[PDB]
Design an enzyme around this catalytic site. Structure first.
Site, PDB file in Angstrom:
ATOM      1  N   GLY A   1      -3.812  12.318 -75.177  1.00  0.00           N
ATOM      2  CA  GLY A   1      -4.235  10.938 -74.976  1.00  0.00           C
ATOM      3  C   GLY A   1      -5.444  10.774 -74.081  1.00  0.00           C
ATOM      4  O   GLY A   1      -5.664  11.578 -73.170  1.00  0.00           O
ATOM      5  N   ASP A   2      -6.227   9.710 -74.342  1.00  0.00           N
ATOM      6  CA  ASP A   2      -7.445   9.365 -73.604  1.00  0.00           C
ATOM      7  C   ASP A   2      -7.442   7.888 -73.187  1.00  0.00           C
ATOM      8  O   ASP A   2      -6.741   7.073 -73.797  1.00  0.00           O
ATOM      9  CB  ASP A   2      -8.687   9.671 -74.462  1.00  0.00           C
TER      10      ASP A   2
ATOM     11  N   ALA B   1      -7.826   4.678 -69.859  1.00  0.00           N
ATOM     12  CA  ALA B   1      -7.157   4.051 -68.708  1.00  0.00           C
ATOM     13  C   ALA B   1      -7.171   4.979 -67.461  1.00  0.00           C
ATOM     14  O   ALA B   1      -8.258   5.234 -66.932  1.00  0.00           O
ATOM     15  CB  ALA B   1      -5.733   3.614 -69.067  1.00  0.00           C
TER      16      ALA B   1
ATOM     17  N   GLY C   1      -6.701   8.177 -67.221  1.00  0.00           N
ATOM     18  CA  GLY C   1      -7.350   9.453 -67.506  1.00  0.00           C
ATOM     19  C   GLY C   1      -6.853  10.195 -68.730  1.00  0.00           C
ATOM     20  O   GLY C   1      -5.982   9.707 -69.461  1.00  0.00           O
TER      21      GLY C   1
ATOM     22  N   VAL D   1      -4.992  13.202 -70.895  1.00  0.00           N
ATOM     23  CA  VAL D   1      -3.727  13.940 -70.913  1.00  0.00           C
ATOM     24  C   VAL D   1      -3.900  15.077 -71.917  1.00  0.00           C
ATOM     25  O   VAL D   1      -4.272  14.837 -73.072  1.00  0.00           O
ATOM     26  CB  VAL D   1      -2.501  13.036 -71.221  1.00  0.00           C
ATOM     27  CG1 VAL D   1      -1.229  13.856 -71.433  1.00  0.00           C
ATOM     28  CG2 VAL D   1      -2.294  11.998 -70.124  1.00  0.00           C
TER      29      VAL D   1
ATOM     30  N   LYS E   1      -2.066  17.008 -67.026  1.00  0.00           N
ATOM     31  CA  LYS E   1      -3.199  16.302 -66.447  1.00  0.00           C
ATOM     32  C   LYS E   1      -3.929  17.255 -65.502  1.00  0.00           C
ATOM     33  O   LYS E   1      -3.307  17.818 -64.594  1.00  0.00           O
ATOM     34  CB  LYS E   1      -2.740  15.023 -65.726  1.00  0.00           C
ATOM     35  CG  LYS E   1      -2.850  13.772 -66.582  1.00  0.00           C
ATOM     36  CD  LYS E   1      -2.803  12.509 -65.737  1.00  0.00           C
ATOM     37  CE  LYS E   1      -3.348  11.314 -66.475  1.00  0.00           C
ATOM     38  NZ  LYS E   1      -3.145  10.062 -65.705  1.00  0.00           N
TER      39      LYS E   1
ATOM     40  N   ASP F   1       6.983  -0.084 -62.902  1.00  0.00           N
ATOM     41  CA  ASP F   1       6.101  -0.163 -64.085  1.00  0.00           C
ATOM     42  C   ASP F   1       6.860   0.094 -65.395  1.00  0.00           C
ATOM     43  O   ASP F   1       6.384   0.838 -66.257  1.00  0.00           O
ATOM     44  CB  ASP F   1       4.904   0.800 -63.958  1.00  0.00           C
ATOM     45  CG  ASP F   1       3.754   0.492 -64.911  1.00  0.00           C
ATOM     46  OD1 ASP F   1       3.648  -0.690 -65.374  1.00  0.00           O
ATOM     47  OD2 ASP F   1       2.940   1.405 -65.167  1.00  0.00           O
TER      48      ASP F   1
HETATM   49  C1  XZN Z   1       0.674  10.520 -75.844  1.00  0.00           C
HETATM   50  O1  XZN Z   1       0.606  11.866 -75.368  1.00  0.00           O
HETATM   51  C2  XZN Z   1       1.712  12.411 -74.762  1.00  0.00           C
HETATM   52  C3  XZN Z   1       1.914  12.224 -73.393  1.00  0.00           C
HETATM   53  C4  XZN Z   1       3.067  12.722 -72.769  1.00  0.00           C
HETATM   54  C5  XZN Z   1       3.259  12.542 -71.387  1.00  0.00           C
HETATM   55  N1  XZN Z   1       2.290  11.868 -70.698  1.00  0.00           N
HETATM   56  C6  XZN Z   1       1.841  12.134 -69.443  1.00  0.00           C
HETATM   57  C7  XZN Z   1       1.657  11.031 -68.612  1.00  0.00           C
HETATM   58  C8  XZN Z   1       1.236  11.212 -67.297  1.00  0.00           C
HETATM   59 CL1  XZN Z   1       0.946   9.785 -66.259  1.00  0.00          CL
HETATM   60  C9  XZN Z   1       1.065  12.487 -66.779  1.00  0.00           C
HETATM   61  O2  XZN Z   1       0.614  12.656 -65.497  1.00  0.00           O
HETATM   62  C10 XZN Z   1       1.475  12.592 -64.359  1.00  0.00           C
HETATM   63  C11 XZN Z   1       1.262  13.593 -67.586  1.00  0.00           C
HETATM   64 CL2  XZN Z   1       0.999  15.203 -66.848  1.00  0.00          CL
HETATM   65  C12 XZN Z   1       1.623  13.431 -68.932  1.00  0.00           C
HETATM   66  C13 XZN Z   1       4.438  13.062 -70.803  1.00  0.00           C
HETATM   67  C14 XZN Z   1       4.761  12.826 -69.579  1.00  0.00           C
HETATM   68  N2  XZN Z   1       5.048  12.562 -68.491  1.00  0.00           N
HETATM   69  C15 XZN Z   1       5.359  13.763 -71.594  1.00  0.00           C
HETATM   70  N3  XZN Z   1       5.136  13.946 -72.908  1.00  0.00           N
HETATM   71  C16 XZN Z   1       4.034  13.435 -73.513  1.00  0.00           C
HETATM   72  C17 XZN Z   1       3.864  13.659 -74.880  1.00  0.00           C
HETATM   73  C18 XZN Z   1       2.752  13.140 -75.556  1.00  0.00           C
HETATM   74  O3  XZN Z   1       2.566  13.393 -76.898  1.00  0.00           O
HETATM   75  C19 XZN Z   1       3.576  13.161 -77.879  1.00  0.00           C
HETATM   76  C20 XZN Z   1       3.054  12.176 -78.906  1.00  0.00           C
HETATM   77  C21 XZN Z   1       3.017  12.834 -80.281  1.00  0.00           C
HETATM   78  N4  XZN Z   1       2.512  11.841 -81.219  1.00  0.00           N
HETATM   79  C22 XZN Z   1       1.078  11.871 -81.536  1.00  0.00           C
HETATM   80  C23 XZN Z   1       0.797  10.758 -82.546  1.00  0.00           C
HETATM   81  N5  XZN Z   1       1.797  10.900 -83.603  1.00  0.00           N
HETATM   82  C24 XZN Z   1       1.331  11.097 -84.969  1.00  0.00           C
HETATM   83  C25 XZN Z   1       3.239  10.851 -83.330  1.00  0.00           C
HETATM   84  C26 XZN Z   1       3.446  10.870 -81.811  1.00  0.00           C
END
Ligand code: XZN
Ligand code: XZN
Lengths: 285, 285
Positions: free
Chosen positions: B20-21, B23, B25, B27, B42, B134
């Site tokens: 993800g991109d 807000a 930052g 990921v 991150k 939040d």
């Molecule tokens: C959206 O990306 C994802 C972010 C995730 C994530 N965020 C995060 C937030 C913060 Cl603030 C952090 O920093 C402290 C840290 Cl280090 C990581 C955490 C956490 N926590 C855990 N798991 C995640 C998984 C993800 O991907 C899965 C989506 C697959 N998908 C792609 C589109 N599609 C076709 C179907 C669905």
């Protein structure tokens, strides 16, 4: 911004003694090496970067708050790790110490001058969007001419330094509105009213309780009133009635309170010049 | 405390892409070089000391919040100026993105599993005295097994980092009580209720308005209700009725809400496993 680092303060200032000790720190008595002018001073040793950053905001508040009824900044310095803050020496000292020295409260004509002058200073503070957040008799200082100087912008500096949505709880929404206009400045108006009661009775409301109970007592108790309403005017009683409004939205501004009969006719500070004279004569006893 | 500086993260982790991109930052998608385990990561470049100090509190919150329904911290690192935060990869992603992918809201049996699991996580958070501040569908992530993982403890870290009297105005007294027990934790309960409406209707209450009006609309409007009460049970309608109490003192805790008929009989996550299966199959379309 206002802190001079290029010039050494010991080449313009000389320490003549200690004025006050305890709580936030030591306050020194200083004299100008050139003009001979007197200043109350603080020579704070910069411990942490946060503590230093907090005092800088205080200096920036002091520097813009150039008003007849607010303590005057005679200079801010930083040399060899020590931060120097020079403020115009207020000879009469604090109003709470005067009440203590004289063993009595202020008379109503004396309260009216304090009130009128504080309302002038607060109206200037609102115009500059500065909230004092620490009004009390202990922060109202006296000059020999019968004028007040509103002091200690420390709590102001901290609450401004710390300051510088569909799922939000209403109580969180509300606290984000008490930390915003047109409510955030109304706090000093309630504090003013408590300071008036404190000057009339020497002690603030709920003084009989330990400080833990006070927060819950301000929250649950009805607005405070004067102990003996027969000892005071209807104008004083009505002033506190409107100023000590628990609802900050209906509570008036310092501008609206300047129109109240309790302060609108005050054209002389004679009552406070007479108070400073009585306190000086009491010291010789 | 929990940030490893002695070990280089590039000797235990490998970046496989960007998840993800925007807000807060970027990921990144990462894999373990030894176990092969997947982590959402991150790699934040430490700009200011304040920004770095804020993320450390977030890591310390993440490290104590070891619970089945809260995102799992797989490690925190600091090497060559870059701060690495490794969290267990949640394959299903966020609930708001699922609703968007499927072009529909969650069914009531699906909401009941989310609600029951969030109420379990919030009850653990209250026990540790951590306020999320939040809650929203965007911070509820999915695993392939039909379990939620409560994410983003950023607003929590900031409101805890910024956190770490006779003349006081009652509104100031009140805001010092909303930043204290037993009110400060009740905010997440209201947020939970808004998240339930958001999952039932895709959008949160007052979405039709610009975000400037929303704060005043939460302050002045009556508690939000479900648009079509005939489409939902009496249990769901009663759950929101009690959880969305504008008064935080009467509003129940997550422990009291676990006893409500809307969640007390939920023994299976089948409805959410069925939701994750439907979203994966929708991607191939
Ligand atoms: C959206 O990306 C994802 C972010 C995730 C994530 N965020 C995060 C937030 C913060 Cl603030 C952090 O920093 C402290 C840290 Cl280090 C990581 C955490 C956490 N926590 C855990 N798991 C995640 C998984 C993800 O991907 C899965 C989506 C697959 N998908 C792609 C589109 N599609 C076709 C179907 C669905
Ligand atoms: C109590 O000491 C005084 C402190 C004063 C003062 N404080 C202050 C606060 C702070 Cl937070 C500062 O730091 C930002 C700085 Cl730099 C100074 C300011 C200011 N502002 C101005 N003027 C003062 C004058 C004083 O002495 C006059 C009392 C004479 N007296 C002695 C006992 N007695 C027999 C009759 C009464």
């Amino acid at each position: 911004e206002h802190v001079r680092r290029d010039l050494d303060p010991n080449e313009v200032w000389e320490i003549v003694g200690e004025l006050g000790d305890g709580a936030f720190g030591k306050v020194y008595k200083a004299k100008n090496k050139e003009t001979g002018a007197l200043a109350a001073a603080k020579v704070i040793e910069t411990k942490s970067e946060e503590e230093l950053e907090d005092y800088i905001v205080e200096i920036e508040i002091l520097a813009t708050c150039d008003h007849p009824y607010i303590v005057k900044l005679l200079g801010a310095y930083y040399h060899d790790g020590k931060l120097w803050i020079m403020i115009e020496f207020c000879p009469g000292g604090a109003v709470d110490a005067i009440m203590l020295e004289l063993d009595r409260g202020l008379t109503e004509p004396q309260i009216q001058v304090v009130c009128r002058q504080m309302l002038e200073a607060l109206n200037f503070l609102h115009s500059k969007r500065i909230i004092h957040r620490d009004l009390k008799a202990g922060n109202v200082l006296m000059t020999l001419e019968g004028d007040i100087r509103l002091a200690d912008f420390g709590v102001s500096a901290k609450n401004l330094k710390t300051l510088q949505p569909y799922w939000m709880a209403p109580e969180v929404v509300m606290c984000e509105t008490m930390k915003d206009t047109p409510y955030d400045y109304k706090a000093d108006i309630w504090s003013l009213g408590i300071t008036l009661i404190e000057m009339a009775q020497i002690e603030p409301p709920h003084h009989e309780l330990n400080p833990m109970r006070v927060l819950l007592k301000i929250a649950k108790s009805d607005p405070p009133t004067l102990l003996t309403p027969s000892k005071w005017s209807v104008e004083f009683r009505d002033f506190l009635k409107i100023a000590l409004d628990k609802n900050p939205e209906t509570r008036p501004s310092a501008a609206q309170l300047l129109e109240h009969p309790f302060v609108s006719s005050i054209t002389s500070n004679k009552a406070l010049r007479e108070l400073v004279a009585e306190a000086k004569a009491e010291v010789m006893e």
